[PDB]
Amino acid sequence: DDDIAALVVDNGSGMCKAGFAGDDAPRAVFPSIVGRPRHQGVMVGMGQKDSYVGDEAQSKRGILTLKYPIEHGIVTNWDDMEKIWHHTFYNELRVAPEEHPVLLTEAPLNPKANREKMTQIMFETFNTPAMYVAIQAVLSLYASGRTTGIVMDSGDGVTHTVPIYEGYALPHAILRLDLAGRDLTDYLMKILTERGYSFTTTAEREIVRDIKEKLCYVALDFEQEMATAASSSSLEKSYELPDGQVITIGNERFRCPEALFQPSFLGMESCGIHETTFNSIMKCDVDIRKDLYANTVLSGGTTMYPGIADRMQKEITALAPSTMKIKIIAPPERKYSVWIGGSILASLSTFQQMWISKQEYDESGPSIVHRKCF
Amino acid sequence: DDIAALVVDNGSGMCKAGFAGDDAPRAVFPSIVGRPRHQGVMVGMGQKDSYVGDEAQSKRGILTLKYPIEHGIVTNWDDMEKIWHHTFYNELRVAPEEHPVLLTEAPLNPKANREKMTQIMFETFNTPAMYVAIQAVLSLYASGRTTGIVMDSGDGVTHTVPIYEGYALPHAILRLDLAGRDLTDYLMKILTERGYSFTTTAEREIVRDIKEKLCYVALDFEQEMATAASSSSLEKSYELPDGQVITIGNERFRCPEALFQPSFLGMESCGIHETTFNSIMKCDVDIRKDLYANTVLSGGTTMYPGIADRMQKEITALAPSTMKIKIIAPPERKYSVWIGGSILASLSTFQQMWISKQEYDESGPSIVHRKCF
Amino acid sequence: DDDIAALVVDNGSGMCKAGFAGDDAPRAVFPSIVGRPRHQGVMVGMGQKDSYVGDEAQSKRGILTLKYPIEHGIVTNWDDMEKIWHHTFYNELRVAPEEHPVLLTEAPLNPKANREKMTQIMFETFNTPAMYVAIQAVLSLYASGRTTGIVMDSGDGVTHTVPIYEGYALPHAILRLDLAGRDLTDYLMKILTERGYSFTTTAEREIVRDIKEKLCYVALDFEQEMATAASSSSLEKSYELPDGQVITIGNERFRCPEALFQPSFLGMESCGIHETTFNSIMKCDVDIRKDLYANTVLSGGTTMYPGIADRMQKEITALAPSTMKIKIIAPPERKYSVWIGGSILASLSTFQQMWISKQEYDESGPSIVHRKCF
Amino acid sequence: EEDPEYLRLRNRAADLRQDFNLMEQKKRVTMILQSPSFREELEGLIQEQMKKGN
Amino acid sequence: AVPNLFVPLNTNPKEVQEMRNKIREQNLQDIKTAGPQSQVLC
Ligand SMILES: Nc1ncnc2c1ncn2[C@@H]1O[C@H](COP(=O)(O)OP(=O)(O)O)[C@@H](O)[C@H]1O
Ligand SMILES: Nc1ncnc2c1ncn2[C@@H]1O[C@H](COP(=O)(O)OP(=O)(O)O)[C@@H](O)[C@H]1O
Numbered sequence A, C: 001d002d003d004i005a006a007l008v009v010d011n012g013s014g015m016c017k018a019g020f021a022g023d024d025a026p027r028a029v030f031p032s033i034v035g036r037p038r039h040q041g042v043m044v045g046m047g048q049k050d051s052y053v054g055d056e057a058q059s060k061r062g063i064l065t066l067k068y069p070i071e072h073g074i075v076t077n078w079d080d081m082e083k084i085w086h087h088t089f090y091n092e093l094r095v096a097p098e099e100h101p102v103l104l105t106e107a108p109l110n111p112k113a114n115r116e117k118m119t120q121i122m123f124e125t126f127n128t129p130a131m132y133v134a135i136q137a138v139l140s141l142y143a144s145g146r147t148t149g150i151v152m153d154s155g156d157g158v159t160h161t162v163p164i165y166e167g168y169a170l171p172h173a174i175l176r177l178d179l180a181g182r183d184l185t186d187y188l189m190k191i192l193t194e195r196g197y198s199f200t201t202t203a204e205r206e207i208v209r210d211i212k213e214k215l216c217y218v219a220l221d222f223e224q225e226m227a228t229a230a231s232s233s234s235l236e237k238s239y240e241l242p243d244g245q246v247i248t249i250g251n252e253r254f255r256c257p258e259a260l261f262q263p264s265f266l267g268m269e270s271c272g273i274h275e276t277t278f279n280s281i282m283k284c285d286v287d288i289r290k291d292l293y294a295n296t297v298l299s300g301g302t303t304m305y306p307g308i309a310d311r312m313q314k315e316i317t318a319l320a321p322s323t324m325k326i327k328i329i330a331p332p333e334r335k336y337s338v339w340i341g342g343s344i345l346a347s348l349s350t351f352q353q354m355w356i357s358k359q360e361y362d363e364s365g366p367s368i369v370h371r372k373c374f
Numbered sequence B: 001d002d003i004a005a006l007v008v009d010n011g012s013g014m015c016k017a018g019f020a021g022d023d024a025p026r027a028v029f030p031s032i033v034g035r036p037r038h039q040g041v042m043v044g045m046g047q048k049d050s051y052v053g054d055e056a057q058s059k060r061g062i063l064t065l066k067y068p069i070e071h072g073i074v075t076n077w078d079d080m081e082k083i084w085h086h087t088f089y090n091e092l093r094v095a096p097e098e099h100p101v102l103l104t105e106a107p108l109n110p111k112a113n114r115e116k117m118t119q120i121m122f123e124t125f126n127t128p129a130m131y132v133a134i135q136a137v138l139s140l141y142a143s144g145r146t147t148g149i150v151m152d153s154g155d156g157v158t159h160t161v162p163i164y165e166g167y168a169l170p171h172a173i174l175r176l177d178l179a180g181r182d183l184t185d186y187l188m189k190i191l192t193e194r195g196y197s198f199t200t201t202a203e204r205e206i207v208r209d210i211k212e213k214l215c216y217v218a219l220d221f222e223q224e225m226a227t228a229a230s231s232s233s234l235e236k237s238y239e240l241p242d243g244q245v246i247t248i249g250n251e252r253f254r255c256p257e258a259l260f261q262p263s264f265l266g267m268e269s270c271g272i273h274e275t276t277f278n279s280i281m282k283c284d285v286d287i288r289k290d291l292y293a294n295t296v297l298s299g300g301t302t303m304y305p306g307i308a309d310r311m312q313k314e315i316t317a318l319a320p321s322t323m324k325i326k327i328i329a330p331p332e333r334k335y336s337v338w339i340g341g342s343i344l345a346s347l348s349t350f351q352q353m354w355i356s357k358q359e360y361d362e363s364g365p366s367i368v369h370r371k372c373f
Numbered sequence D: 001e002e003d004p005e006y007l008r009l010r011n012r013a014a015d016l017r018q019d020f021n022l023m024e025q026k027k028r029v030t031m032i033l034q035s036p037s038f039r040e041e042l043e044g045l046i047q048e049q050m051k052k053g054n
Numbered sequence E: 001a002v003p004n005l006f007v008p009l010n011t012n013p014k015e016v017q018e019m020r021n022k023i024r025e026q027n028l029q030d031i032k033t034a035g036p037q038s039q040v041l042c
């Protein structure tokens, strides 16, 4: 408070998290949604607004069309993005952006112009003194405590695995897959139609996402678990809807996350995450693979399915040579780990040299971010 | 501040009127028009072509009572003009040019009704501003909550509408043509079984008084049939205007039961409890548990003793068992709409929403669909 | 000892069609309604009919409460549906059910209990020798005679779009919409309310459906058509009730089917049928899209309004890139097209090995329908 | 109550509180920061990205 | 424009809540009041 502390903002497709530099915990975590009313409103003299933003939007789900501003990790509606950032700065943190620097995170492989846009609407409108952009998955490795290893980050919008050697990333070995939690929610909604239950609107998609977060797990063996569900009815759970109805999902608990390992269910050509990180390792040099097998770190919201670590280790050990040792690293707070890495990066004294000055931006236009940020 | 507005509720049965910002209406009187039918022989008593409102009720022996509003629709506009003139000049004693007026009407009505109402209130009475509102929204104002499903039953029509957080879902509005006049006609039909015959329009008011005084909603229908068949403890005695004494007995809880089973009248439609449940299920998933906890009863027809317990039990039976059902019936639910009107009429932010006289002049009577609701 | 031609039985919601295999047109077409009396029978010596089934039930509409056994393509009353099937087999076609194979149709995304119950009640009660269940849209594209195209079937009950390229159907590109003729009939009742006419009973709902069939059209330009209807009274038509009363529709002629393209009138937030077709096309692979833009096929009774083809072609051209040609194929007899395709699929000599046999049913149970047919 | 702290406790769900407590107990940022060797090793590493970028 | 055509936006609900209580105060206190008297009468 005596000195200006930077703002660490982690912004993915699913939720937005914001906090102060050097803090243990982010101050605000809220879904990245902008809702607009659809029904006729006749109640004059009481509270109506033309648009709802943040957790207030998810509170009044029954009278809105929920609309995600970030699609597959790419910003597609910039006005809603500015509204999200305004609600982040003023409603939640309640600090003006002009006093403090801000730090943003972004996907590894992306359209170029997005970064330019993230520059232009951050200096021109919010009048920040300085900012910086960092790759999301590097911060997971920084927060885990390791300078060398391969990290998979599978958020709600995009999945990507990057190998980092001696704290300094390799661009040619970066693998990006467009398969994340939202596609899993859509697949779960599609396969829940076969039992009779129907979910079609946006609030129903939020309810289905809640069902997925509550009752899903990854089977160690798909065939054995499927035969087990074919034998008895011990794999049945009952979830109570906000209407008051009770549904019994049963067999679908381990079929929804299995699309992560077998993307042929969705019809996509690309194969599962385990062989994806195997190919990412194989694209690197032979000498560094020994450190890469022993330092595999999982991160992101989708990687919080129960039993994901054992299945991942078994598959990647089946793919790996027999003489090599496999170690998976699953932090218990992996869902926030990227933000934690940001808090590490905003506290280093050398990082004061990294900041893009406002004068430098005014001199060089919005293209300063490619040469300044790596 | 300046001049206060007028609040007028025109239901199908009775008309209510008062000043905005007041607790209760000043003038409450039945909406009837009577004309004489016999010969007049006494020379010099003076002539009177029509009897309007309460004056027609006292001299109803020598008149043919006629209702201008039928099923929530104004059929005879001349009698409506007579009723409005009587309300403005004889009941409230105010010049209509100084005051704005706020009117009430049903959810689903023909367009020509609203257009003709706007044309009448601008062209003849020369009011400076006017507005039309739905009655059940005003009931939700009277209750004082932002969220709930409200069911209003008058003398002309019954309607249910759900509102969530100030937004009203238009596709979930349900209208049912089962009201107090149909129950009065059914009581006239079932009173024949004991030997009492009422035919002319004068005796319809006697039957209505009988219904208002000695009718109640049974909690369990078949058990009450068994009880009334076993004993004579359910009989009550009423005195006619001419001095004869009638005794109803079994028919006390069979007339208001017909709301819950419309097959007694020959109607194919469902009961009021099933109508409310269906209107709830027409909404979205997330607002249903809020609508279960804020059901509001409105209108005079819901003033039978024991209506709340029967409604709560029926909706509890139909709904899933994991949630709680509470029915909020204020004791003064007869005038709730009018009270809501007052709360709407003198809000500070409502003053920009009156239909101006200049706007009507430059737009025709079609301006009421663009504004209002 | 020639093999006897099979029976083709098309069952959407609201109409049942049936005929012999190898014939051009079905023998029997009748509404799928069942009515029961509600009033007291006082004349002794009358016939004792508990239930009026089918077209006969539409003769005496005044004394019955009509009900539909299918709701949104799902059979909600099986014992009632058995009456329609028995009346079809014994009274219209008057054929022995044990002597011919039976071919049936259903919607794409249905609960598995529907298919299993259909197979069980066809083998166990009517004692058929063989049966098969086929998806309707594939049959319609058989009737069109092209081996590659996207077909949008809109019937009373359901609307669904499937694409087919070179005899292969993509399962993930199938889209299903619960916006159909019955919802349009209800909306027509709601908008006819404000003119001054009130219809409440189901017998009056049939009259409203007849008014919709006789006097409706789809406008190319909605705002211009509304302005024309407001300016002049030329767009007015008259209808006579069974009571005998001239009613005049006027504005509501082109507003009832316009809800197909703008489902926000009903309160549903789903996209229109044009955007549904476009989204189904864009979900497919790139190299087939051009062919799918050139072979759009319409089917079903709901697509029988005048001016649907021109409006849909204009809207898809407004959505598609300008360099491609959009052609809308609408046969004049398209309402029966699904059934026609079934007859062709019942007449191929190649198909005859793929009937679900009774013998294999005896050991596989009613679950053989998922293994055998699509 | 009208206090924003009371509404802050009123609004947020149980799992957010669970995560906040879980990653407040371990204090990962403090463990990375006040430990000298790792902290000043990243100090140096960021020094060579400055050297190496331009 | 179509969702909230009929009402103005950004209005506090506390105003309506205050006015309902103000009207209920007269019922509790049993106030004598007369209607507004006309200017032409004056
Ligand atoms: N405990 C959990 N179990 C299963 N899935 C989860 C869990 N928590 C989050 N998810 C999934 O992960 C998504 C959130 O991912 P997140 O890491 O917040 O994305 P980002 O932070 O990149 O925006 C949610 O949409 C949800 O589907
Ligand atoms: N105390 C009462 N008990 C039972 N029924 C009543 C009572 N008062 C009125 N009613 C019924 O309600 C009708 C009047 O309802 P009202 O509120 O005047 O309707 P509206 O104002 O909409 O015309 C009467 O016809 C009568 O049938």
Ligand SMILES: Nc1ncnc2c1ncn2[C@@H]1O[C@H](COP(=O)(O)OP(=O)(O)O)[C@@H](O)[C@H]1O
Residues within 6 Å of the ligand: C011, C012, C013, C014, C015, C016, C154, C155, C156, C157, C181, C182, C209, C212, C213, C214, C300, C301, C302, C304, C305, C335
């Ligand atoms: N000539 C027509 N013009 C306009 N609409 C029609 C016509 N014929 C039928 N319809 C509508 O189509 C529906 C019948 O659909 P149909 O094709 O019979 O469904 P299915 O065959 O799947 O049962 C009816 O509800 C009616 O509203």
